Subunit: 120 residues, 2 copies
């Protein structure tokens, strides 16, 4: 199956997402940090990252920039509803797509499926 990594600081949301994507057939890894992310990757093959850019003490747009500088991994950002700026900046950093909170899961899974089709 395709390997998805969810980068999500908030434990409830972490579980909700991992649960939903596991239920849809994916190999899912979770991490709360960009260090966690950098670790799963150097150490495992990852097809797509769902990256919540509201990471306390961390810059998720610069994490995006770094990822795309190094690899063609799929990147879908999770942004807040007060984040218009982050949308365009996030795409400029190299994200393939973004979705906003609150997270509409049915639509997110279709975006993930379509991007994975492009990736593989």
């Amino acid at each position: 199956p395709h390997h998805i990594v969810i980068v999500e600081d908030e434990p409830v949301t972490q579980a909700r997402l991992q649960s939903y994507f596991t239920q849809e057939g994916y190999t899912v890894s979770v991490t709360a940090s960009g260090a966690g992310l950098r670790e799963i990757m150097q150490n495992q093959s990852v097809d797509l990252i769902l990256l919540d850019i509201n990471l306390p003490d961390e810059n998720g747009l610069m994490l995006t920039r770094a990822l795309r500088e190094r690899s063609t991994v799929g990147i879908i950002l999770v942004t807040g509803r007060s984040d218009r700026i982050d949308r365009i900046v996030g795409l400029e950093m190299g994200a393939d797509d973004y979705v906003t909170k609150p997270l509409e899961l049915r639509e997110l899974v279709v975006r993930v499926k379509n991007l994975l089709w492009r990736i593989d």
Copy 2:
């Protein structure tokens, strides 16, 4: 260079899209119908289509799946009516993205850039 086709009935939207994408160095063709699109695609290769749902001949949602069933062509659907069944159906039919009027144009230019990069991988 990359070839984009704009399929759009509303003239101001069509004019803004062709103008912005021409400045980015793309080769751009415009049309206002499914038939017009089909003619262009028989005559030249097309990398990416910006496609309105509202067309005079066939629904753009149906055009989307007809195209995607054969091709990896980029498809971004454009609508003037935020509507959930159109959005989910459109993405399920194979659209790479779905955007609403009035267009966030700078955002669309970057989306197009990234999608073309992704198709070229």
